[PDB]
Structure formats: C-alpha cells, structure tokens
Design a protein around this ligand. Sequence first.
Ligand SMILES: Nc1ncnc2c1ncn2[C@@H]1O[C@H](COP(=O)(O)OP(=O)(O)O)[C@@H](O)[C@H]1O
Ligand SMILES: Nc1ncnc2c1ncn2[C@@H]1O[C@H](COP(=O)(O)OP(=O)(O)O)[C@@H](O)[C@H]1O
Ligand SMILES: [Mg+2]
Ligand SMILES: [Mg+2]
Ligand SMILES: [Mg+2]
Lengths: 526, 308, 488, 351, 100, 201
Amino acid sequence: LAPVNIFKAGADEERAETARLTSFIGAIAIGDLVKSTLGPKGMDKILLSSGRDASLMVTNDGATILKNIGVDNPAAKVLVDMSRVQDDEVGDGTTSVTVLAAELLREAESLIAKKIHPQTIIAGWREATKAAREALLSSAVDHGSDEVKFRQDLMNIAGTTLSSKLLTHHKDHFTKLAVEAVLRLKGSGNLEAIHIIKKLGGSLADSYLDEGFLLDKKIGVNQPKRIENAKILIANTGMDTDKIKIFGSRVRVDSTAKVAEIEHAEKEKMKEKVERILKHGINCFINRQLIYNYPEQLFGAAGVMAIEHADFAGVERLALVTGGEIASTFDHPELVKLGSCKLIEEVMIGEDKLIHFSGVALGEACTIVLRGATQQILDEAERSLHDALCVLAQTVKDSRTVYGGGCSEMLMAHAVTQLANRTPGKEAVAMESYAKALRMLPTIIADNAGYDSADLVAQLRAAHSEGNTTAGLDMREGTIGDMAILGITESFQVKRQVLLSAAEAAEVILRVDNIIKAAPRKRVPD
Amino acid sequence: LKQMQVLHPAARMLVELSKAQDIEAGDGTTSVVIIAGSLLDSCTKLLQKGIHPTIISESFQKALEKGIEILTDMSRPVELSDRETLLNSATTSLNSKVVSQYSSLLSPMSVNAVMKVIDPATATSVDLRDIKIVKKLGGTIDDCELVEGLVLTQKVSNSGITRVEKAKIGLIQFCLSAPKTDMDNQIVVSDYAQMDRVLREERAYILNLVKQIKKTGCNVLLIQKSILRDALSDLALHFLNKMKIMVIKDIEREDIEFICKTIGTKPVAHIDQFTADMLGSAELAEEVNLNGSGKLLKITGCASPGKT
Amino acid sequence: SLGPNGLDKMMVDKDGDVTVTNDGATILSMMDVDHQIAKLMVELSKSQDDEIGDGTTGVVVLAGALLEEAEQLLDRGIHPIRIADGYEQAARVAIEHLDKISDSVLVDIKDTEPLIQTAKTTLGSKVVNSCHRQMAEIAVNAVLTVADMERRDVDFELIKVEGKVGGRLEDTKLIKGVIVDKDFSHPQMPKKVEDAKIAILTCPFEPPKPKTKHKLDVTSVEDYKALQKYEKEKFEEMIQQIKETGANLAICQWGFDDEANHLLLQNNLPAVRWVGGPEIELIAIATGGRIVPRFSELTAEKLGFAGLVQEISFGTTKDKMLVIEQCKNSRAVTIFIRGGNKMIIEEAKRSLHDALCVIRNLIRDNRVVYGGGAAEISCALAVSQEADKCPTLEQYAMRAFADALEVIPMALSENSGMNPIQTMTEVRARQVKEMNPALGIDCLHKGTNDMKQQHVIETLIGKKQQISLATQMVRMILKIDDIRKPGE
Amino acid sequence: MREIVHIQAGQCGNQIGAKFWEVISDEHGIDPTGTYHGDSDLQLDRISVYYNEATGGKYVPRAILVDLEPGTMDSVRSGPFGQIFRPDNFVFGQSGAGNNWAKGHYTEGAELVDSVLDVVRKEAESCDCLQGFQLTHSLGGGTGSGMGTLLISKIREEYPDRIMNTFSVVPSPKVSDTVVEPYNATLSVHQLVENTDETYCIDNEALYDICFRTLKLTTPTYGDLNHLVSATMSGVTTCLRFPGQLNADLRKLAVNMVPFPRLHFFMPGFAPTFIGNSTAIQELFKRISEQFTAMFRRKAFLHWYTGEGMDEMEFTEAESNMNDLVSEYQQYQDATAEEEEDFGEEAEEEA
Amino acid sequence: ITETKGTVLIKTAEELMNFSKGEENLMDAQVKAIADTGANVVVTGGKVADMALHYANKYNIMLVRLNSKWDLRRLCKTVGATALPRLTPPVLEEMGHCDS
Amino acid sequence: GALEDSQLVAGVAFKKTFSYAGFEMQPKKYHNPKIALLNVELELKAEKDNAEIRVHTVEDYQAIVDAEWNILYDKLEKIHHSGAKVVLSKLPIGDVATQYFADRDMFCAGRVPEEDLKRTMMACGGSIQTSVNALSADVLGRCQVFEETQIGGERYNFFTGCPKAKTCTFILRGGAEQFMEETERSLHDAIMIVRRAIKND
Ligand SMILES: Nc1ncnc2c1ncn2[C@@H]1O[C@H](COP(=O)(O)OP(=O)(O)O)[C@@H](O)[C@H]1O
Ligand SMILES: Nc1ncnc2c1ncn2[C@@H]1O[C@H](COP(=O)(O)OP(=O)(O)O)[C@@H](O)[C@H]1O
Ligand SMILES: [Mg+2]
Ligand SMILES: [Mg+2]
Ligand SMILES: [Mg+2]
C-alpha cells in the first residue's frame, strides 16, 4: 500500500485477489441459500422480520426469499436483482436461474485457479451459450392448431408448475382451477381481471372458482335484496354533494329566505340528476364513489339496487363480466350500453356477506375463493396460484413447449460438449465447465429426494448421448423414464430466459477486478 | 392464546389455528390446539426411527380420511322442531364456564334467539349480526334478559317526557337548524331593519319545519349524528317540547339498518318526504333507570316486527 | 481498464447502490478522494469527457506517466520550469506531426461504412460488444437522422435514450418516432389507431378560470340555474370544437374531468393525459404539428400526422407504454434499450452515449488516424528524432516526453497477456524499417500488425486533445512548490 | 416611516428581547458597535421603522428596558449585543416585587412608571409618526404582570388610538413554578382583555418539548427556548421589517385575522411561521380558573394582597369576567355543548 | 398611494384593459411635468420605480439616490435646494444649482 | 479545451437560459436581425397583487376570462409589428409567448443577467424598454450575425459583427476550475497595466 492516502476516512478498496474472493463467496452463498427449495421434494423457509413488527411468512418462492433478506455483499445484489426481474418477466424460474449463476461462478473460480485469463473464459462461455440456445430451439414442440392436444398440454404445464409448492397436496383439484380461469380470458393477457379472494376458515380443498362474480360491498337501506333478469348501469360520477361547481363562486344575499330558496334549488338539482339516471330503464346502479343518503332514498323509492364505493378495479372487472360501459353525464340514453345478468343475490361465506352475480353475459373476468386454516397457508396458496396463472398466460400467448425433469439441461450439455470436443486451446476447457454447470440442476433435484444422484445422472447422460432425447428423472420412483409419456412439460420462454439471464449475470460478475466503497451515510442515532 | 404474546414462529401458527376454528364452529378452540400438539409430539419418534416427513404426511392424510368416515357413521340425525335436543346441546356447551350455575336461565334464552331470527323451513345458515349483545354493569348474572324490541343507551334530549304509549316513530337524516348551503354563503347587512328581519325569518324557518313534523302525528323522533352542522338547535328543541314530542339525538351512522329492520321505520332525508307512511308503530317507548348504573331506553311492542 | 481486453470496476455508492462500469470519467467521478492532485486528475478526465466524449482513461494514464518520468530529471538537478518548457515543445512537435499522417474519411448518408467501422472501434471495449455491430449501426443511423449538416451541429435534446428492464439485450431498437410512459385515459378506448391526426393542446379540459383574484356572486335561483347551464354548455362546446377540426387523437399536458373523459369516449376520439412538456415538444417536432394553448385557436393546418399510434404492454406487470411511429421525415429519434439487469441497462446507455459522441466528432472534423498504439509510436519516433538536434539541455525533457508517450502500447500489451518490451521494440523496428505509421499491437490475436486492414480507427481531434490537455495539466502540477492545509 | 417602539419588562422579557434584537440586527447588517456593513440596499428600504439614526452613522434601537431589580440590566450590558442600546433607556428600582401582583401594581410600580412615561415621551419625540407599541412580559411574575399591566393602562391613557401588541408567556398545565401563579394570571388577563388589540400567548412546556424530541439533542436551560421565541418573533415581524410580494403591518394582519374585538388571543407555530386563532385557548383558561376558585374558596395567601390596598371583590370581578370570556369562547363551537353535566338525580316526571 | 389599505376593484373587462395604460400615462405626465421646469438631475431618498427610471432615461434626467436622511440635508445646504415631500414640479426658489 | 482555443469576440456572448417547451422549434441563425431589449414580464398572470374582481353574470365572467388573453396578445403583437427578430428580457418569458414566437420564426430569451443585457445594449446600441407602447426604430439594436453554438457541453448565444461596439468578450478554455481562475487572474494584471499605460506613457 502506497504511503500517501488518496481516500477519505471510511473509504475502502479491494484489488484483484480479494475482489474475486469476495464476489465468489457472496455468489456461492446466495446460491446455496436457495438450493434447498428446488424440485418436487424441496422444503420451505420461515421468514420473520426483526424490524417490520415481527411479520411471519412461510414460503418456497425464490424471489420472495431473496427480496426479503438484508444482503450487503455487492456481488449478491446483482443476483437478487436478476431474480427479481426474472419474476417480473415470466413469473416462473426464479430459483433455477440463481442456482445456475452460482454454479457458473463456482466453476469459474477453479478455472481462474488454473491460471486462465477471464476473457478466455468469457469467450468460451459465449460460444457455449450460442450452441446451447440453438440446441434448445431445435427441440421445441409447437401445438395450438388442435384444441384437445393444446388443452392437454395446458393441464400438463399447470401440473408441472404446481408440483413443487404446497398446492401439490391436491394437485389435480387446483389444476382444474388454473386452466379454466385462464380460458375465461378469451386471449387477453390481463391478469388483473382474475380476482383472488382469500378468507380464513375451512379446508384447502374447499376452494373453488365461481361461475359468476363476487363483490365484497354493501347495498343501501330500503332497497331490494335480490333481482332477477337484471339491467345494470355502471357509472363513475359524483353523488355526494355532486355540485362541485368547480368555479370560485359564492352566495351573497341580504335575507335568510333567499338562502333557503337556494338550498331547495340545490336539492332539486340532485333530484333532476337522479331522474335522468333512471330514464335509462335500469334496476341496478353501480358507482365507484360514495352515494349520499338523499339519492339513496330516491333510488329506494324507485326500487333500484345501488352499489357504492366500488373502486376502479371493481368497475373495470364488472364491465368485463357483464358488458356495459362506464358512463357519465347521462344525457344520451341511446348511446350507452347496459350490462345484463340473470340473478343478483347475497351469499354468506365464513362470517361475511358478499354480492353474487349469476348468469352473466360475457364472463371475461372471474373470481377465485381460497380457503385455509392459517394466514400463511392462504398467502402461500395465492403466491403459487399466481405463478401458475402467469406461466399459463405466457404459454397461451406463445404455444411451444419443451420437456422437463432434466431433459432440457442434458440436451444443452450434450450440445456444448460436442462443440467443446471440436475446438483447440484453453477455450475448450472453459466450454466443458459450462456443461458441468448445466448438469448440476438435475443432480440437485435428485439430491433433494435422497436418490443416488451420481448413478442417475450417469444413466441420463448415457441415454442422451446415444439419441434418447426424451429421457428424464421419474421422481415418484426415482428412475429414468420417458418425459413425453409421463407428461412433464414446460414452456420454451421460461427455459430460454433462465439460460440467457444466468449466462449474462455470470459474465457481468466475472469481469470485475477492483471494488471501491465510499464512506457510508451514518444513521443519526441521537 | 391471543392475549399472550407467543414469540416462537411455530407457536405463532397455533393461535391462528384456533382463530380458524372460532370462525367455522365457535366451539372446540382448545381441543384443536391439544390435538395439533399431540400429533406433533407423536411425530418425533417417527422422525427418530428414520421415517421421512413426506411419508408421515401421507399417512396422516390417510388416517384423517378414515376418521372422518368413522365419526360420520357415529352421528345421529336431528330436526329443528325438537327443542329438547337444542336445549341439551346448549347446556352442554355452557357447563364449562363460570356461568354454568346460571345455565337454567341462559340455556333457553340462547335457543329462543336463534329461533326468532331464522326461518326454520328454509334456514341454511344464521346471521349473528341480527342478535345484539348489550353489556350493562350492576346487578348480578341472574338479571340478564331477552328484549323483543329495541334497546338504546343514549338519553332523551327532551326535558320532561319519558313515557309514550302507542308511539309513532320517525327517523330523520337532515338537520333542524339554520339554513346553510353547501356552497360558501354569507348574509350582508347595510341597514338596521335587516337585523330584525334576519331573526324573524330564522324563527319562521325553524317553526315551519317543526309544524310540518307535527302534522303527521309523530310522537318519538330519532335524529342521526351529524358532525359538520348542528343537527338540533335550542330553538327547535324548545318548539318540539312545546308540541309534546320526545326527541332522541346522536344516532350512530352504522346501526341505522338494524333500527329500520327492527321497528320498521323508513329513513327520511328530506322534509318533503316526511309523510305518515314512513313512520313505525310501537306499543311502548320509554326510558328506564337502573338503580345506580344509569339509564336505558326501551321500545317494545312493534306492530311490524323484523327478525332481530 | 484500457483496451479491448480491459476489466471493469464496481463502485458501491454512499447509500449502498452498486454500479459496474468501465468509463474513466464515471470511475473517477464516483471515487471520493482527499488528495488535491487526485481531484485535479478527476477534473482533467471530466473535461476530456465534456468536449470529446471518448478517451477519458488514456489521458490520465498519459499524465501519470509524464509525472513519473519527470522524477528522475528532478533528481538530477533540473529546474521544473525547464522540464515544463521541454514538455511543451515536445507536445508542439507531436501535434504538428500528428496531422501529417491523417487521412480523411467522407461523411455522407449513402455510404455509412467508415462511420460504422469507427463506432465498432469505439464500442469494442465495452460489455455491449456481444452485439456491437447492431448498436454501432443504431448509433450511426440516429446521428445521421438528427444531425444538421449546413451548420455542422447536432443536438442531443432531439435524441431520447431510455431503457426498460426485461427481455434481451438484442431487443434494443431504434424508433423514428416517440415513445412515452403513458396510456389512454379511458379503459374502454381502442388500443391502436392507424391514420392518426394528432391535436396537441396545452389547456386543461376544464371550464376557464382567470388568474387574478375573482368572485362570482350568486344572488338568486335564476343565477344558480344559469351557472348550471353554463358549465355543461362549456363542456359540450370544447368537445365540439375539438371534433370539428377533423382530429382523430388528442394529447393534453394536464388532466381531464369525468364528464370530459366520457364525452371523449362517446365521440370515438381517444386521448392521452398528463404528458410532460419535453414530450409535448418532441411529439410536435416528430409529427409536424403545432402546439396550441386554446380550443378556439385550433385549426385544420395545426394537426400532426402519424402513421401508427399503439399501446404496447410488457410482461406480467400492469405497466403500459405508448409508441408513435411511421411519421414522415422526422427530426426526433428514440433508442429503446432492453436487458436482464439494471446495471446492464446503465452500461448500455453509457456505451451508446460514447458512440454518439464519436460520430458527432466525425461530423465536426472528417479526418482520422489508426489506433492500436501506432500513432503514439510514430509520434514518439518523431519527437526523438527532433530531440536529437537539440543541444541546449532540453534534449532530456524531450526524451522524457518520448519515453512517457510509449506507455499506451505497453499497457495494451500487458493487458492482452503478451510481453511488453519485446512487442513494442519489434513494432518500432518494423515501423522504422518499412514506411507505414499504421503498425500497432495485435490485441485480438488475428495474426497481422497492420491496423489499416484490421479497421481500427480513431478521430484526430481526440488524439490532439488528449496530448494537449495532458501536457497542460502536467505543467500546472509541476509549478506548485508549497501547500498549507489544516490538520485532523 | 410609521415607527414602532419596543418595551421589555421583567427578567423573562429582558431575556427574550436581548435575543430578538440580536436576531434582527444580523438581518439588517448592523454591528455590535452600531455601524452598518450590509450589501443589499433592500435591507434599508424599511430600516427606520425599528432603528433611529444618529449623527455619525450609528443606528440605535427604539427600545426601552424596564425592571424593578438591577440584576438583569448588568447582564444585558455585560452580554452580547448589549452595547448598541441607548444608555439612558435603562430604568430600574432597588428592591423588587418578589412575585407579588399588588406590590408591582400599587406600591413599587407607582413610583417608577413616571420614569418610563418620561422615557417613552423622548423616544416618541424623535419619530415622524409612530403607529404602535410592542410589549414583552410574563403573566406569572410580579414585575412582569402587575407592573406591565399598569404600564399598559398608563400608555393607553396617554396614547389613545395607537395599536398595541403583547408577547406574553403563560403558566404551564402540569407544572407551576410559583405558588400564587393563578392569582397573578387571573388578575392580569382581566386587563389584558380590554387594553390590547392582540396577544400572542406562548407556553413554556409546549415549546420546551421540541428541543428534546425534534432537535434530537438537548439538556438545556432557559437558553434555547429564548432563542426559539426570538426566532418566532422575527418570523412574525418580517412583514413590517422587509418588503415582499405583499407587505402588511400587524394591523393589516389583524383586520383579516380578528373579526370580533374581544377574541384576540393566538397560538403560534414554527416549521423551518404559523399564527392561528385556534380555540384551544378555551382549554387553557378553563384550567386557570379551575385553580383560582380552588384557592379562593380557602382564602389562601389572601392577606399578602389585602395588606397592599386591594379589596376582596376585585378577585370576584376578575373571576366573573374570566368565566364570561370562557363562555364567549365556548359559544363558537356548539360541539363542546354536548359535554354537559351528566344528570345524577332521578326526578324525570311529567315536566 | 393611500396610507390606508387600498384595492383596485374592477367589475367589467374594459377597466381591466385600461388600468395599466392609465397608470403608465399618469407616470409619463408626471415625469414630463417635472422635466419641463429645466431640472437636469433629480436626487431622491427612497426607492426608484422601473417605469419612472425608464421615463427619466427618455427625457435625459440624471437620477441619483442616497439613503441617509443626513447626507440629503447636507446636500440641500450645499446646493441651496429645499427638500420636497411631494412629487410635484418644483418652483424656481426650490432649484438647487451646481456647476458640475 | 486547450489554452490556445481561447477567443475574443468583438460583440457579446452569453450562456443559454432556462427555456420552456417550444424553444427547439424556432430558428437559430439570423443575418440582419433587429434586437428588442426589454424589462417586461411576458406571461399570463394577474395584473396586480392589489387587484380583485367582483362579477354577477356568466357573460361578464367569460368576458373577464378573454380580457387577459387579449392583453397578452396585445403586447405580443406590439412586439411583433416592430420588425424585431430577437427579443431579450431580464424578466421571465412564458410558454405561451415562447410558442407564439416560435410560430412566427423568432427567437426569445428570458431571465438574462443584468450585466449581460447592459453589455448587449452597449455592443448593439439600443435601449432597455419597460413598456411596449412605443417600439420605434431608434430603440432597437442591430447586429450582423446572431448564432447559438455548442461550446464544450454548453450552449452559447453569440452576437457578432458590430463595428460600433464599445465592448469585447473573452472566452477562456481550460481543463480544471482553478486553471481558468488562474488564467483570469493573470489576464487582470495585464488589463490594469494597459489601462494605466494608456494615460501616462
Ligand atoms: N414431476 C416432476 N418430475 C421431475 N421434475 C420436475 C417435476 N416437477 C417439476 N420438476 C422440475 O423442477 C423444476 C422446477 O423448480 P421449482 O422448484 O418449481 O422452482 P423454479 O421453477 O422457480 O425453479 C423444473 O426444472 C422441473 O424440471
Ligand atoms: N481492436 C483493437 N486492437 C488494438 N487496440 C485497440 C482495439 N480497439 C481499441 N483499441 C485501443 O483501445 C484504446 C481505447 O481504450 P478504451 O478502453 O476504449 O478507453 P478510452 O477509449 O477512453 O481510452 C485505444 O487507444 C485503442 O488504440
Ligand atoms: Mg417453479
Ligand atoms: Mg367448549
Ligand atoms: Mg473508448
């Protein structure tokens, strides 16, 4: 260290050896933190907060685990961010990507120990990634022209995605919820159209998908409690002191009777507006804002059910379900469309009452009721159903699939090994390492079930080398089996994203040779 | 379990378990926790023997599936028309608490309530928000009672009237005060006659509303709470007293549905709609004075009783 | 951190944020230093960044080598003013020689190949080199689309660079239109139009309001009813005024009302809300419209035309974006960057900025030299040959300048994994034997030492600025003999 | 131009004024020697309202310093910024009131108020057209309250239609430093009501609970409390001292702020200034009266006042008018009327 | 302006348009009336407005300001001028005279 | 930049000021422009802080609303009809005025520093106007080239080509803040020496 000080007090610098040591330690620690939750027989983690009022949760999601821990190592933040954006993009694949990145870094440390320049490793990995992505692309199977095959593929994808999460206790049941719900969207990717309602009590197998719609709102006093053959007007307008006549006007008179007269005129304005609303021929009114108690009795006298305070999401979901439009100004009854439903009533679930719409016209939005015996169970169930719906929507958008259970990783590794056997120099030693990373995802899975991972991986490699391109792990017994027969199916987009993101994150981290830290901002104690 | 503060993350789930039972059944909140603890205790030896947790979970599911069938085969059908079975079930559920000695008083009441809220021919569930529990200090446990009417805790603002027989009741959601537009208003005076005129017109304005209310035959008036303008001024209260009308104010905004369901009133938010057909009829409306604990208000004998 | 084989730095901010970078200017900017000479080096790098945009790390290395070489001369009994004067004379000789070995390129829209090669050379050192052909072409196309050729000036306010996380780095593209982070104001409006006539407004969709203090006295019931009619008449009037002119889509800088929103929906005319000022002027320049502050001033000649206006939706999130494309000849252009990390996005932005700055420099002056250390070796040879004729004790300073000018090839060789002294001596001997100044360091191991066929190209103004700025900063440093500072 | 003179009475008043003038002088560029070294002439557009210019260039404050004990003037002269004042404006006695209202109002004050009235005459003779007075004092002391109130009455007699503003500290809710604090406060509010245009009540505990919790570090003495009060006063008077987008003297604030003449008590605030007619004043007086009666029913410490000349019915009139003030404040809410005395008896018969 | 608070209260549009022109015309008339007496230099002890300065520059009047309340009196003694509390065209007897 | 890139302009130059939307849609080079130097705030605002409006009918409400726009446009047309192509003001220029000037091929700047505006007056030869009711030909400036140019990361406005100028401006190019500060300190000595040498020689 030079005698002259270039830095302030508290600033820090680490150079090549220490920089690489710190980065590799952080990356490997992050990978091994979440290795344990991979595959059909992974376990869950308990997270409790020291600061956030002792909040408690039980989770298996990789992104949820990584977004909550307080990492301070700079090399771990890159992995956390990559996992987060993977979750934001496809919604599945959060654990495989970070495990693969950690394995790549673990191989790179030994490669550096063998006196190989980082740039050589980077070039070898780039070529290996190109070959692996080509081999994956050539293996895709594209259905979608035939309805029954596509629906069977959707069921297989949902079952594969739900196998590692708690819902696997009732894997068939919840599968029927995951497919049908998505098929209600009629090709729209709006996942906000599916509302998930979770409420305590009852068992996990009592959950269902409603054939109509459910609102957790209330109707006004002295209005009908149920209507048959309803006609629905959906509005977004002010009804509590509607006369925000936005000008800066004021009342300046010389007598109290004039104030009384102006008050009466104010009431007549609301009466006229309510009459104009009723001119449409409705018997149900839904508003997103509050409704004062004078229009409440005006609606009650006319035998019209009124719903108040149904926020933007509720208004849009009802517009999708029934088919009306969100109207205002009520001057042209002919140009506005009304929603229709066969019955509206009130149902009682647990300890609460909800408004139930049955016999709806379109049905392009749905609601799901989750039941369970604990808050953590309900939260994890929602967290898993979200992944299932996300992957199903991705598959519907782009319908080409691959095989899971270690088939795809073995295919990629075989292609990379064949490429590496053809090239001269040190780069070959890099590419082989790449393959040894891809064959670690299957091994880990077997390691979570207590099987002899080495023998199974050797058999799988031997089978893939001779042309059996559909071999994979059969985990209900722990053998080698056909993935097409057993129905282990995944989407192409998720695997491609996992591969590309892991490769780019490893390349980004591997190029760092010097870490510089500024003086931390001191928390003001007193 | 809720009143303690359990610190262990595992013990923080058991409490939730009890909560779930309270939602589903309302009884057996202790037994479920005992059973969960016993099962988790039995799991230890299986873990030591070398069993895997997955096998334990599957076997527990199989045992549960058999146990449900056994318990169902144990059962015995019942019909709601047999009150003896309901009384026996209630007194069994009630003989573990401090009020077991008063069971011969509390057992029937409960049953009565549940048979005065539902329709037995088509009852598929019960709404317990239709039954209101009022806690009043003083006396002993032997003084609990069942009221088939309306009970209120706030006193009457009227000074002198405490009994109304053959009461006609109306519910008000507007204010008997000086005029005030929702838009900013002010009265400008530039001559000395206007000062007297303002007072005279105010008096006439209040008197007109009071006379309109009296014209329909109302004896008991309920006024809902308002926190932006005065809902009842001294002049209006004086006029209402001069016409022998009992006034009750500060009705909460959340129990209006219960009141309307009980006594058959229809809320009125405009003086033009205050007609004789929006009124409810009761046989007696009066305030009672408990010995030292305070006052109370009872409305009993409703011609059109709801299911509360 | 020099050359195509250089490594990068990771800076952790004062609040914990992480930045992985390769730029010299950014590296020196995020460091917190105490020594004053360090701050002077930081400011030298920042100034070089400000004018040229590339070459921010070569200049600091050159200055450090110059100061290092001055030490032995100071130890032998030389006045530092003499060293500064010798450095200045050597710098003048080098700059005079530099433009003698320079070739022109030609700057024209038809060819674009020399410009692509220059951008490729600039981007070869960054993490974006996995797709640097694409990004080089993007940069050259953007600059050629925006640039002013008669005045020989470009404006970077007409180039919008922005990125969004997700997707792949290869999804980055060039849009000859606009893209904003907004969406239509009503959930039931159509998501695309194909013959868009844009009406650009600066007034909110509300009844008018004077700015000075005002009061409107209501004294009766007829006044109340008149005001009530006036409100809705104003709303219908503004909607009709918008519709009459023939417009098809409306864009506002401020908010709407519920009545205005439903009236826009009912009349089959989409709208956008709460867009910013710079976005307004960019849309006006792109679509060829005009910005109007009132509905009364709207005419048919003030509408812009857009071939396509679309609302694009990204992945499982709820976000939306609005794209305006297929405009006529446009002076506004957008770069849309994708990627799987935030650090990747930041570094891609910095690399694209470097490429744009280099192409701007080529627009200003159109003659180039060849890199790889060929120019530095030739300049060192010229300086030494001139110094051999100087007997007035100044030959030592000139030879020090020539020796310190040769640290760039040595740094390149050391980074590439070769042996510095032997490689530099071989290339120097070849340059003296043959008569070409285009022989450098074979960093990528392609077999040839000639940089004219390897197509490694640099601008002349960059080299001139590096040399002169480093020399002047060294001269300023050498002048100081005293320093007083409080203790801690 | 429309000059204002400032009067400080008592130890607390002197302590607050010594910092008020210090924080004003640095704004206008004045030096502790009286010279001027400012830069922007915007500071000199309204300099004459608070400073009188002497021959030679010096600026002297338009201030009078008063107390019955010579202890505080020695500190003021020996302290910072204590040598710009006119040496002839210090008025002091020899004994002190000893926290007795009657001694300050009847015995010791009567022989010294003439000196104050002869000094204010000479300070007013030098201003072209004065517009009002500033007074700083306390309600819990003897010299601050009784003598200050007598001075207010005398000034109101001598100067009929000039504005008058006060900055009075008030007794704290849960702690009383002096045993006879309710007596002094009640007897001074009576004559604060009818002889001032506005009063700026300042509490010690409320502002004292800012240094511990908001300032993050203190175990202080009266010190920084005083500086905060001075900062509040400067933020109040910036309108008078400086021109801005809308300049307005304290009358032009009062006319917009005081609709009804007798309800002229305020509660300040500070956010680095806020002045509000919050009716939370009715809570303070309701407490003070609550104490007053509790003592007056026992005739405690009464002989200390009666011996000085006061009569027993003065207390009765003071408490009656305090009750009148409390009721006048209460008649503006109509919501506290809901908290009437709960009925305890059982007679609720026919009528 | 007035000593008591004053506000400009308008009720129609034409007054709103004409107010500023009225003020400007009045200020120009005042400055020209002052200049017509032959005064070349004006010395004041207070603020100078922008429009007043513009009209002084229009009519070639030297404008100096000083704020001491004592330098003004000494200058008045020096040049034989009498201070004026109003902005009116002064009389010959109140003219000060200076060679340079 | 290098120390040999410093320059002297026989005219005036000053930095770009803060600008609203529309500034990028107006020309940036002129050959024989006329300059209007102003001290007037050109934007939609309240006429006076003391003002107050009381009105009884909605028709008069609309008339009052139109009055402000009519006033602003009156000022803008009075500026436009004088033939000026460049306008400068010490007081802010609104976005409405910016777009109005852009639509008629003109250039505007606001919040110009007072010293720079006085320097421009001396170089070009006009007069600062606090009112727009008489913009004659004798109160406008005249230059020979106006331009806006990129100088090392900044934008500078140049008025050059005035032979009647009593003013020059220096542009100094350096590499660090203390470098240009020392350059300016060195030049100050030479300036003072030259001034003293002109009188006594
Ligand atoms: N029934 C199954 N048999 C074999 N492998 C499976 C089965 N279900 C899932 N997998 C494998 O488990 C992996 C899924 O990882 P998971 O634990 O769901 O988290 P993530 O999908 O976020 O990595 C996939 O690679 C898939 O190949
Ligand atoms: N293909 C190449 N072969 C040899 N040298 C190269 C090549 N590409 C770039 N260089 C050298 O890299 C240097 C530029 O370094 P770089 O890391 O881009 O930062 P900067 O451009 O700021 O100096 C130049 O001197 C150039 O000669
Ligand atoms: Mg998964
Ligand atoms: Mg029990
Ligand atoms: Mg570069």
